[PDB]
A paper describes a structure:
Neisseria gonorrhoeae responds to host-derived antimicrobials by inducing the expression of the mtrCDE-encoded multidrug efflux pump, which expels microbicides, such as bile salts, fatty acids, and multiple extrinsically administered drugs, from the cell. The mtrCDE genes are organized in a three-gene operon, and their expression is repressed by the divergently transcribed transcription regulator MtrR, which is a dimeric TetR family member with a predicted N-terminal helix-turn-helix (HTH) DNA binding motif and a C-terminal dimerization/inducer-binding domain. As in other bacterial multidrug-binding regulators, MtrR likely responds to the influx of multiple cytotoxins into the cytoplasm by dissociating from the mtrC promoter and relieving repression of mtrCDE gene expression.
The native structure was refined to 2.0-Å resolution with final Rwork and Rfree values of 20.4% and 24.7%, respectively. The asymmetric unit contains two MtrR dimers, with nearly all 210 residues of each protomer observed, with the exception of residues 1 through 7 in two subunits or 1 through 8 in the other subunits. The subunits of each dimer are composed of nine α helices. MtrR has two distinguishable functional domains: an N-terminal DNA binding domain with a helix-turn-helix (HTH) motif and a C-terminal dimerization/ligand-binding domain. The dimer interface is formed primarily by the burial of hydrophobic residues in the middle of a four-helix bundle that is formed by α8 and α9 of each subunit. As observed in all other TetR family members, the multidrug-binding pocket of MtrR is located in the C-terminal domain with ligand-binding residues contributed from all C-terminal helices except α9. The initial solvent-flattened electron density map revealed positive electron density in each of the four independent putative ligand-binding pockets of each MtrR protomer, suggesting a “ligand” was fortuitously captured during the purification or crystallization process. The density could be fit by CAPS, the biological buffer component of the MtrR crystallization reagent. Thus, our final structural model of MtrR does not contain CAPS. This cavity is primarily composed of nonpolar residues and is populated with more than 20 hydrophobic or aromatic amino acid residues.
Residue numbers in the entry:
A (entry chain A): 8 to 72, 83 to 209
B (entry chain B): 9 to 75, 82 to 210
The structure:
């Protein structure tokens, strides 16, 4: 039963990746899945639900893989998987490059915003554990730190996709991550 | 030419409302209050209007950099970029369009090609700032210039993306100077940005 839901969302992933989210229709997804519109509707009422499910599959894969070191490993595995996992590659390609913030995509954008809030809470908890464990300074500005972490990671992703993958992500990401973590631990501009 | 600028801002406003892919030349002409023939005389297609907007953005930046040491000027230029991103409607709308309303589809392939040309321009300009800073001994002689440019663009693009994509939910005036100061400290001191 989970295989029928998976076939439809992967057909959605393929159509989104080719046409973008705004121009993708339910009929195209159903056609690409080789199913009827009614069969698609049985599992997913709309593009929002397909995109949201894609978000959950990405987050499930990440979570199914001390605390400050695990975070570092998680960031490194994330960028490796962007190069080796076709679903993670295409999903983030869609999110950053094929998902325009227009009124037409408002409900898809609302789903994306819900997942940004979730990443925010997960990073904030990582920082909290690192502070109590003395991996980070007691006067760390956690709010600025979260913005800093997300901006660093988003910049590398956006830059990699928008450049047409014109630089080696396997060599670049550990260096970007290493500088980021050094800044979080030591740079005074990230303190209250 | 004031007739050309009227057309470019009609394109900017329509791009900002509808996105680049869904905008048609007729809508731009209509919004500018001119005929399709009048528009085509100055701009053959959406790409060239987008290209002209890119140039106005670059002209604005260069006519302000024209106002000690080039490395300190670079700091000011970066700070001024994010300030006008928040205070100048043309710079706000254009970069909003670029990051959030310009999807990388086959339909937009020609627009994307224009953007790629201007990324190459920014890359060359950042490389020249880096070359000057090394020659002025503001940056180490063994700076990895290739990684540093990628590093600079990634830091700045990430902040812009984050600000727009979050719905401007944090204070850019207070956040960008911290980000810039850290970025420039890393370029000056961090060993990961060295060739060795």
């Amino acid at each position: 039963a989970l295989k029928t839901k998976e076939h439809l969302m992967l057909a959605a992933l393929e159509t989104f990746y080719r046409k973008g989210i705004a121009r993708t229709s339910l009929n195209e997804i159903a056609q690409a899945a080789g199913v009827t519109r009614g069969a698609l509707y049985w599992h997913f009422k709309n593009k929002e639900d397909l995109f949201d499910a894609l978000f959950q599959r990405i987050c499930d894969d990440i979570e199914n893989c001390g605390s400050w070191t695990v975070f570092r490993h998680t960031l490194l595995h994330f960028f490796e998987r962007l190069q080796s996992n076709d679903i993670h590659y295409k999903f983030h390609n869609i999110l950053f490059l094929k998902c325009e913030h227009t009124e037409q995509n408002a409900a898809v954008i609302a789903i994306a915003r819900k997942h940004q809030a979730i990443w925010r809470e997960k990073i904030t908890a990582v920082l909290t554990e690192a502070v109590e464990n003395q991996d980070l300074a007691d006067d760390l500005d956690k709010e600025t730190a979260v913005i800093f972490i997300k901006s660093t990671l988003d910049g590398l992703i956006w830059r990699w996709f928008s450049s047409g993958e014109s630089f080696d992500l396997g060599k670049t990401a550990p260096r970007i991550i290493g500088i980021m973590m050094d800044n979080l631990e030591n740079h005074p501009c990230l303190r209250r």
